[PDB]
Amino acid sequence: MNYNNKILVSESGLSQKHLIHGDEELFQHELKTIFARNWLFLTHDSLIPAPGDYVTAKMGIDEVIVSRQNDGSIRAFLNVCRHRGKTLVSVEAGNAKGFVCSYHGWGFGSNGELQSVPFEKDLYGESLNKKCLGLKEVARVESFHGFIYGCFDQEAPPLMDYLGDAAWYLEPMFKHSGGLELVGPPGKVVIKANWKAPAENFVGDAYHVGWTHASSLRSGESIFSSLAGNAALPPEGAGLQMTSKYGSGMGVLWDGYSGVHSADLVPELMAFGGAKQERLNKEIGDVRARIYRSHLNCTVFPNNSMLTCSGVFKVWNPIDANTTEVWTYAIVEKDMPEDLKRRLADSVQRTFGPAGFWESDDNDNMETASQNGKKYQSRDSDLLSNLGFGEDVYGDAVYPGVVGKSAIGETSYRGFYRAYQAHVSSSNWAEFEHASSTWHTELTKT
C-alpha cells in the first residue's frame, strides 16, 4: 500500500476505510508514523516520586524504563541491554540506583550510562568505550501537571503545544483543582481489538452510551442513568465536543462530576466537586470552574484516554492490528480525603477495570469492529463519522478548538482521524505540519 497516496480517511474526516482496524502492514507503518513520532503516556509523578524510583512502560510495542533522577528530573530508556540485547528490567516498578543485566552482568545507571562491566580491565582492557554504550534514551520526556509523556522523535512539538486546544479543557481538573494523583498499579488486560477502536470511542463517542451501556446504566444508578436503553436524550446544552490540530479531543458533559460512579459515591462526590467549583469561580471564572466539575471523555492522541471525574485513565497499548493491551489506572484529586481516594480508585476498577462491568459492555463492539476490518468484503468499506458535520465551529469566544455545541456527535472522531491521516501520509513532523496548515477549515466545511 502506498501511504503517500492511499486515502484511508476521507476529506474532513468524514469516513475511514475499515481496513485501518485490521491491516497488519498498516499497523507496522503506524509504529513508525504514529507511535515513534507522537507523545505517549508513561507514568505520573505520584508513581515515581523519589530519586531511584522507576517503572516500566510501553511506547508502541517498545518497552522503556522510566526513572526519577537524583536532580528530580525524569529520563526514559529502552529496556534493552546494549551488549546482546536482553531485556534489562523484568519488574513493573521499584527503586534502584541502576540495573544489572542477567546475561553477562553489565551494569547501567539510573541515568542510562554504562557504569560497570564485569572484569572490564582483564577482558576489555581500555578498549571498551562505555561512554558510547549508554541505554538508548527516549529523546523527549515532558510533564503535564505531573502526567509524564515520552516521545522518540526529537522534532515533536512541546507536549503543551501538542495538546493544542484540548489543554484549555483539561487545565481546570489537571491544574486548578490543586493537582491529580495517579493511583497504581494499573489493571492490565489484553483485548482482541485494534488500539484505534477504544481510542476513537473515548475521544468522541457519547452516542453509544445509552445503548451499549444500557445494562450498566440501569444496574449501577450513576448520574447518567437516565440514558439507559436510549430511554432519554440529554437535553440541549447538556454538553459539547471538541477536537484539535494534533488529534486530541474530548466530549464535555456539563456538571457530571460523579460520572459513572454508583449511587454509593454520588452524594459525596457531588458535594466535593461543587464545593471546589465555588472556590474556583473566583480564580478561573464561572465557565472554567464548571468545566472542572464536568465529565470529560478525552483521548490524548494517539492512545491515551481518560474520563475525568469518573477518574478513569487508560493506555491502549498496541500489540498487533487486532490485539491491544489495556492499562487502567485511577486518577484522584490530591486534596480529596484519603478514604474517598481509596473508594474512588476501587470504583474506577469496579466500572472500567479488568472486571469493569461498564468496560465489559464495550468488548464485543471494539473486538468485532476491529476484526471485521480483516474480512475481505469489508476492507474497502467506509466507517462513517459524519454526525454533526457542517455544524462545527472554530475560534469560538468561549470554547476553543473545533467545537460541536452538542453533547452527542462525531466532531472528535473527525479531528482524530484527520490528524491520523496526516501522520500516516507524512515522513516527518515538517510534512505533518504542511498537511495540517488548514486543519480547522477542513473540519468545519459546509
Binding site: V91, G94, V189, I191, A214, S215, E221, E325, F357
Partner: protein, 192 residues
Amino acid sequence: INIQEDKLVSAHDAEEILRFFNCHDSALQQEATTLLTQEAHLLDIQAYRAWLEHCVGSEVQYQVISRELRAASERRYKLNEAMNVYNENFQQLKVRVEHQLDPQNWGNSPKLRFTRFITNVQAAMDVNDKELLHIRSNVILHRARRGNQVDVFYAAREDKWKRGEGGVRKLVQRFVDYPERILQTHNLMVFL
C-alpha cells in the same frame, strides 16, 4: 515453615498453612466440599440470584487483587502493591448480578456457558470465632461464548464462611490474589 529459611514464602502464605496443618476435621472437609460444589453449580447454571440468597452473607467482602510485579529483593519502593479487580460488599455484588440479568446486557446473548472445577479443598474452624469456618480451594473456570471464544481462569481462593439466616453457611469473605498479572481472557468478568 520458617520464612527466613524458606526464602520464597510470604508471611501471609506461611500463616495460612499453619491454619490447616493443625486440627484436621475430616467431616468439616466434607462439609466444605459440599458447600463449594453447590456454590459452583449455582454459578455454572447462572443462577446468580440463588447464589446471592443461598451462598453469600450480608457482611461479605468479595475481593480479587492483581499484584504489581516487583523485584524479589525490593525493600525501598513502598507504594500501593495491588489493585482490586473486585472488592465488593453485598450491594455491589447485587449490582453485578442485576447487570448479568438485565435483558439489555447484549453480551449475554447468545447465552454464555460456564464450567467450574473445584479442587484442593481444605477447611478449619477459626480458633477465636468458633462460628467462623476457613475454607481454601482452587478453581479452574471455563467460560465459552460466541462459537469460538474460550477463556480459562485459574486461582486459589481463601474463604471465610459463617452460619447465617436459617443456619445456612454463607460466604463472608473471599480473597483471591490472581496469579496472572496481564489477563489474556478479554476480561475478569466471572465470579471466581
